[model samples]
Structure formats: structure tokens, C-alpha cells
Target: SREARLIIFHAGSLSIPLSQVEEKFTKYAQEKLGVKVTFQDEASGSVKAVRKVTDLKKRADIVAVADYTLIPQLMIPNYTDFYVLFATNEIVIAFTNKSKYADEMLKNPDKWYEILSRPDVSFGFSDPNQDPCGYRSVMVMKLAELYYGRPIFKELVEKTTNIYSNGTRIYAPKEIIIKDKRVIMRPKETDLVGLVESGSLDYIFIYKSVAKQHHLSYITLPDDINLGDFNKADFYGRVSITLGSTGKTIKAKPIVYGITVLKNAPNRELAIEFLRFLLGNEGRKIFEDNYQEFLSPPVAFGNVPPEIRRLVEVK
Candidate 1:
């Protein structure tokens, strides 16, 4: 007997695309397989979503994360054996029209940080320890220092906290300490959306896809700093982030999205069917339509399920 339950834990930033795919697939699966599909999804920061499965012992048939590395770092050979890189995204400074100096900031795009640094202006970002978007935001600041040949990083990051190092490599503090009511930190990138909409924040560090989906204005960063260009991997690697609690070091790289099914998924057969549809043409279209660029052929890391391997290229 086929199970109707299909559980998923995914990044909060992916809520829009995933929900659309779920709706289309649910109908498709029910019609084709004569199984009434029911989805149980939980969206949060990518790290927190994985922790719900690994640390809290929650059950998830499928797990998708914004940063592909998390699958290997946190769940490999434990919660799951392999993962597939299916999509990519870039970071940007998102805002609404109600934000302070929104008009002036738009007119002078190059002085984005300068505007954000103003005493009366406030900005928000996700917690670095809990979300990939959070750490990537920090990486952008570091890269900006080199790209623009300015003290943007120092003005925004270093002055806010006590600097530290690891074997000749300097790193910013996990919790940035901007001494004013000018910064807000949430647990996930998408969580900052309400703050921006409500005019509580003048700007927010978030993905370009999120800015588009939410219908907000955003400043596009350069390829070398946006973490969107694969050819700039060498340059991007120059910066790394050190997590406070775990002492983990994450080097910068192009942002990629990954997905996998747990080995212990209660609805293993149903999960496979869902994955087949998701990595197939229809699901890719859903992501593309939402402004989330997809890899021409998804790259598989290890031991992809036979049922869905045809949809991905083995790496």
C-alpha cells in the first residue's frame, strides 16, 4: 500500500517555489498513481531545518537546503548518504520604498553601505550561525572592502565587534556588535521580510530571489562579491567565516541549493516518486519561473537514488 504522507524540511527562502511545486505535484501524483498525496512541510533557516532532523530527532522524508555544503557537513553518512545540487542564488541588499533615503540610495547605488551606516538608518540580516544567507552577508561585506577599495567592511563589521583570528586568518565575530539600534538579526533570511515591509528596517541582506518574490527593491552586487559566479570561486574563497559555538570554518563559494531524501524515510517509495517529479522538468520550471536559476543538469554528489538519477548528472 502506498503511503499518503510526504514530509519535507526546507529552507525558508524556498517557501514560495516549494509550495507551488507541492501543489502541482500533489495533483499529478494523485491522478497518476491513485494515491491521495498529503504534504507535511516545515520551512526555516537551512541549518535549523537540518537540526530539526539531526538534533531534535524529527522525521523528514526530504531535506533541502540553501547551501549545498550543509548536507555534507551536517547530515552525510548519518541522516542521509548523498545529496544533489539543483539550483543557485545570489545575495543582495533588499528594501522597500518606505525605507529612509530609499530614493537617494537608488540614485547613488555605489554608496549602499554608506547609507546603511547612517545613524538614523537601520538594517537587518539573518543570524550567521543559523542561516547560510547570514554568513554570506558577512562574506559580502569582506569582499566589498576589496572590490570597492573602501573600508566598507570595517565600517560595517570590524567596528562593531572585537576581531579575532585562526592560524593567520582573521575573522569577524559571530554576533556582530553594531552599537546602536541600527541593526536587527533574525533566525532566518526570510524572517526579515516583515521588518522591511513594515518600515522597521531600511535594508536587509537577503537573496535576489527573495527580493523578487516579495516584490521589494534591491541593489545587485558584483559577480566577484555576489557569490553567484562559479568562475569567481577562486576570488570568493579568499574570505571565510568562523562559527562561534561550533568553531567551524566555512570558506566562501558560489551559492548552491541541494536536496536529498533520508534513508529512514517512512514513506520511502512515495518520497522517491516525489523526488522524481521535483527534479524533473516541471519542478525546474517552477523554480525558474520564481526567478531561482537552476543548474542545466543538476549535479549529484553521491549515490543518488536509481529512480531519480536520470534527472541529474553524476559529479
Candidate 2:
């Protein structure tokens, strides 16, 4: 037949690991099934990635996101029947040698909010309406107030931007506004890397793995606010936000990546096999080496495919 062609939409942070999986899977397919495979992929904010399929009516053989809940919240019934929660990551402040106050930040990591608050410093996070990491970044800062006993959310974000909160929950404007050029925003978190590298920006709130992958220096966040620890799910939920994009109230939760084959996937058989490969031994190795932690016995929900069922812990 033809070289099996597939298209995958995944979170920008997944770029490196997914690329490794794509190459290894292609090699495995050629060796085991004598099938030639070709992949066309796009890395986007997980939320916008879903919109590409749901709102824009685009084609997607596979959809992966930084947040597991996005699958059921946005695509469960209409676009995909089930999704697998596959990996986890934490948020961190990424910087470079070119950044201002790099040494100061290292000397007093706990005073992070204070240093970034200086008018001369510039910082970035993904747009909340477009990316999970974006929303989670806000949640982390909000939680910082509780953890560090400071008005971090106010001084660092609310004082200059349009996002606001009532101490119980934060609200995202339909159209976000950040007046100060010192505060930066992008559709996706990874997009800020260029700015940091070129010294256009000073620092960024990004996934630790992403910073590690890009070889950027970063300060590790506390376990309580980082959202990387599943055991802290309840603590994370204490902070919440409503996205203007969906007008839905969402509480912060531990970060766990999710993936699914779209119901309308054109290459259903091939897609299933690819997912099988991605969720199995070969894929796990690649993810581990790429500076990300894959969920062992990945967790799945909704109508999971039978062939993939044996590999995951169905819920």
C-alpha cells in the first residue's frame, strides 16, 4: 500500500520526546511490519491544539495535551472517545546568562517574586487562554502567596495585567491585557525561549523539562506549588481560575499529560499501532532520556481501545 501517513497534535513541551518516538516508531514499523510510515506534526499550546480540531475543523490523527482534563472537557464525546494520561512535568523559572539579576536570583531564590517585580526586569508565561502551562503558571503564583507569605500574584502579575482574583479564585479576561512591556506573553510557553535566549526577555515561567531540553538555566520550584506531584493534587486545587476562552471554572491540579487517537482519525489502524508503540516499552525509554517522566502503567479513561487496554491502568 502507501506509506502510512499520520498527523499528531501535541503540547509544545512534548516536542523532543515525541520526535524521538516518531523516529523510533518508524524504524520499528519498518522492521516488524515492513510498513513505511510518514509523520506530519504540530506542537502547540494544548488548549489551542484542541481548538485546531474542534473550532477550526482541522484533521488530527492524534491529540496530546499537557493537561489530562482537557481531553474530557473539550473533546471526549465529539472528537475523541477516550484519552490516556501519559506523563508529568513541573513549572520553573527559566533564564539565561544574558538575563538581568541572574546572580541575584541564584543568591536568593526565595525572593523570586520580589526580584522579578523590579521595573527593569522582563518575564513571560504562556497566554492562559491558549495553553495549560499558562493557566497553571497563574495558579502557581497564586499558591506562592500561601507558601511564601507574600502578595506575589498581585505584585508580579495583577498590578500590571488584566488577570485578577478574589483570593479564592482568579479570573482571566476574554481578551487578556498586559500593559507593561516588561511582562511578556505568547500563545504557547515554548515560544518564549527565543526571547530569553536573545536577551529580549529576562526570565520565563516554563516547564522544567522544557528548560532542561533547551539547556536554559532554571530555578526549581517548591513541590507544593510546582503541580508536578500527584500527591499534592488537593493542595493545588485550593487555587482556581476561569478561562475566558471557555468560561469554565477550573481548579489547579497536578500536571499530567494526556494523549488520544481522534475518533475521526483517517488512519485508524495505523494510529492505534502508533499509540500502542508510544504507550509501550520503546516509547517509555525515549521519554525517560528526554528529561520527562512518563507515567508507568499509564492511566486511561473513557472508551479505550481494546488493543491498548492491556498496556494501561484503565479507570
Candidate 3:
């Protein structure tokens, strides 16, 4: 029997659909392909997943991140030549009925910050340095300032922390800034879900798919600020965020998810075949069933090897 041993390191936000993808792919490979397929998943902040390979020297057959940029910025020129920009998501304020101000916050976006800014009201997001949702969380807040005609982003980023005092703020070329200490930062977004459910956090910045899977009541931001609409890409560019010292400030734009096969792989063939299944129509159904809207035809970036390119079209 043919067999493939594959390891996948992916973003925490992808936990739901990816798990389903894994189960489905495993069955397909075993029954139809006459192959034994095994999968291992290491989930964390998207950047942290790359750091395991880039910084920690971890080995993986496949890498999927919530933020597409993590591939070009962290993986390319080092771990991989190019990556596939395959999915998209949005920033959402996830909550539950047990949450404080859930009643009022759901009906109005304008009052959310005010409620969240309250001393008793606590919220958390993943580390901006580690997660795409983390930085995009800040960008959404900044855009909220412009949308609501208020200084929520300013008051939060400028007045919150002194971390920006040491010229780190210079890295912030856009209007959005994370001053320092006002917003509690976690290592990953999934970690905060427990905090919200436990009532330790009044709210959290998370992906909409996550909230839906967990049955959390989340307030959806408008398309103009949700970072979910590719149609609003240019408008989303209005805000830029500086990741101190990375020399590249992330442009506020639509959330585009990405994935890639590592250059070095013990299970390269299996990994490639699995990815083909993921980018195909059946995989898209899995994503949509899990509340992650498919990108119609998923976009592949870089020189996708001929075998894998069959599953996606290069844009």
C-alpha cells in the first residue's frame, strides 16, 4: 500500500475547517488512493507558525497562515520560494450572551469601544507580532476612528502605552497605532476564546468563522472596515500599521489567507496531493460548511509546482 506521512503547521483560526479538511483528506487518501495518510497539526498564531520553521528550525510539510503576507515576509527567501493566497476572513468582536454589554454592543458598533474602554470591560487580541488578526485588529480599530468620526484608535494607541515612546511609533506609518499597554495581548487568538467564555474577558478580536463555529455572538463590522471584502482593498489601504523594526508596515487591507508546501519535506508528495484536495471544489464545501466563505476560485501565488498548480490558478 502507498502511504504518506504529512505534518501541517497552521494558524489557530483555521482550527475548525482544517480539522475537517484533515479528516476528509485522510479518509480519501486511505480509501481511494490506496495510501496510508497520517496528519499532524501544530496550531498557533500565523507568524508564530512560520517562526517555528524560520526561527526555531522546526520541520513541516505544509504551512498555512491566516495572513497571506506572512509567507512573503517570513517564509520567502528563506523557507519557501512562494506561497498560495487561498482564503479570506474578517476581524470581529466575538462575545457571548454571558458577556458584559452583549445586549447593547450587538445593535451598535459605535458604542462598542466606549463599552470596551470601560474600566471593568476587558478585551484581548493575539500579539500583533505573531498574528495577522492581531495587527488587523488594530487596523480595524484605526479605521473605526475614521468611520465613526471619533478618536478610538488614537486614544487607544497613542495614550495607552509608552512602548511607542522610543521611536517605535515611527514604524507606524499609518494612522493606527498600539501605544503599548491598554489592550491585553495574548499569544494566540484561540487562547483568548477560553478567556471570553470564562468571562475573564468581556470581548475579543477574533475571526468571524471562529465565532460561528463556537456559537459565539459576534458583531460584524461593515464591509468598508471589516477587512473581509477584496472589493474594498484600496479603501482598506487607507490605514497602515507599523510592526516596530520589521521595516515593513502592514497595509490595512482585506483579509487574505495563505498556504504553502515547505521546500524540504519528508512527505512532499503526500503534502502536495493533500493540498490539491484542499484547493478543489470539495475542500471549498468544507470551508463554506464551517462558515469560511470560499474565494470563488482560490488564488495561487508564486511558481506553484506543476502538480499543485493543477488545483489552483495563478493570478
Candidate 4:
């Protein structure tokens, strides 16, 4: 049997699930398909992740994002034309029991801000330019300010996160941004998961599923601010913020993760085969185990390629 090797660039938020998928896919390839499988996994903001292909001019067998829209917005005209919408996630404030004020702040919305805003308290987010969760973290804060009917939003943004001169807030695409010059800020969201566990970070804005998968305690944000409800698209629209240097304010949309095989894939047939596994029952189970609630009939956006039409039913 021949070996099938593939490169995958993915969003930082998908670290957990993709790792599982990688293991499972490799196992299947080795045992079931009787093929040798190799994967190179690089995780960053979906935008930055795609840059490895589009900007860096690197080729990958597949590209996946925590936010599916990045595919159409960044990859469609250039690196990829077809994308499959496969999974979804909800937002939550993730913290460990060792975090400062973990017990009291969890019960008090007002106190949560007071505790998080403390000079001693440290928090992190993914980079807004690179990671959706990074920008969405700001969105969640702004939305929370409105939802809680308090000035907590302004205090958190102005005091905690960095603001660019153009009024766009800067986040690590998926890294923690503490005002302190001493704390380290990494480019990927999952990178900081260790800090939270080690008590270096008091809190982090993470997907609900990530918190669950890691067994971290998390406070679920209100539905009004979580960006989980498709029904609240209009309400989500009312709140918007310009992103870092991009001058693009993402109106709140339902959170859907998208995946696509690269147009110039080195192994197109094998890539499609892997995609079929991902969009099929096996992939669905992988998503569930990693944190995504099942969206059995995932949404496939316009311009999907005809070669894999059977794998996706357009919404």
C-alpha cells in the first residue's frame, strides 16, 4: 500500500478536536486503509492559518477554521474555492479553581468584572486580526456590557485589552493580552491553556467546549452575547466593533466552523478522501468528542466544488 501524507493548517481554537481527528484518521489510514499517513498540523487564527497557504505560498492538503466565513472571505478567490461547514461552538469565560476570585466572581456578574479588571488579575484572548475568538472575545464583552446593562464593557475594553489608535482593539488573534509588560502573549489560543492550568492566567475567553474538554470550569455567557443563536442574528447585528487595522467590523453571525480541501492540493484524491471521512459519520463523532455539538446536516456555502457534492447537502 502507498503512503498518504497531508498537511493541514487550522485555527487555534480547533486544537483539541483536530488533534483527535488526526489520531483517529491516522489510525484508520494505518489499520483500515492499510496506508501510511502523515500530517503536519499548524494552528493559528483562521486568517493567519490561511496565510500559510495564500501569503506564505505554502501548500496544504486541507484548511480548517473555527470560523467558516474566513474561508470565503480570505481563501475563496485565491487558495480555495470550495468549503464545507462542519461544526459549531459556543462562547464561555474559562477559568480554573485556582484563578483569583474564581468562586465569588463566578456568581456575580458585576464582581466578575471587578475581579478581572484588578491590576493583579491577568487575562488573555486570541488575536483579533488572526483569530475569530480574539475579536469575538471583544464582541462578547461589548455584548455582555449591553446584556448586563452596566458600564462593565467599557471598563474591560479600555482597561484590560489593547486599543489601536484607529479605535480597533488589538488581540493576539488567539493570545492572551495582559496590560502588564511582564506577562507573555502568544499567538495561538490553545497555547495559553497551560498558563490557566498552572495559575499564571486568572481567566481566558474560550469556547464552551474547550473548557469542557479540558475539564476546566467555565461560566456560560448569556445567550444575548454568546453568538450561539441563529435566531438572534438581528440582535447580534446591533453590536459591532472594528477589528485591528483591518477596519472591518464583523457583525455578529451564527458561529459555524468551515473546512475545505485546497484547490492546489498536492494529493487531491487523498485530500477528498480525508474530507469525506470528516464530513461523514466518523468526522461527526470526532467533532462531538472534541466539543462541537453535532450539526448532522452541516451548512455548505455557495461555490462548493462538484467533485464532493455528495458529501455535503447545501443549506
Best by lDDT: 2
Tell me which of candidates 1 and 4 scores higher on lDDT. Answer: 1
Give lDDT tens digits, candidate 3, residues 102-127.
89898886578788777666677777
Model 4 C-alpha lDDT per residue in residues 1-315, reported as the tens digit of each score: 378788898988787777877777888877767888888888788867877787689879899888787777777777877778877887787889998889876788445656766777788776667778777777777777767777666676655545421222323322335565423345666776888999888888878878888888878767787888878877777766565434455666668888888889998777777877777777778787776865667667767766557767875
**Candidate 4, which ten residues in sequence have the lowest lDDT sum?**
165-174
Best by TM-score: 2
Two-way TM-score contest, 1 vs 4, winner: 1
Clashing residue pairs, backbone N/CA/C < 3 A, model 4: 124-176, 126-173, 126-174, 126-175, 127-171, 127-172, 127-173, 127-174, 131-173
The residue-level lDDT of candidate 4 at 249 comes to: 57
TM-score result, candidate 2? 0.97
Candidate 2 structure lDDT: 0.90
The lowest-lDDT stretch of 10 consecutive residues in candidate 2 is 1-10
What's the ranking of the predictions by TM-score, best on top? Answer: 2, 1, 3, 4
* Residue 263, candidate 2: C-alpha displacement in angstroms: 0.8
Please, what is the whole-model Cα lDDT of each candidate in the order they appear? 0.85, 0.90, 0.78, 0.74
**Pairs in clash, predicted candidate 2:** none
In candidate 3, the residue pairs with backbone N, CA or C atoms under 3 Å apart (3 or more residues apart, or in different chains) clash, namely none
Q: Please list the residue runs of candidate 3 whose C-alpha ends up more than 4 Å from where it truly belongs after superposition.
A: 1-3, 162-183, 244-247
**Can you write out model 1's per-residue Cα lDDT over 1-315, one digit (the tens) per residue?**
543888999998999999999999889987898888889998888877888888898998999999988888878899898899999999999898999999988788888989978878888778777788987887888888878888777777656544433432446455556565577888899999999999988999999999999999988888889999999999989888876633667888999999999989989888888888988989999999999967989999877899987889987
Alpha-carbon RMSD to native, per candidate? 2.0, 1.2, 3.4, 3.1
On TM-score, the stronger of 2 and 4 is 2
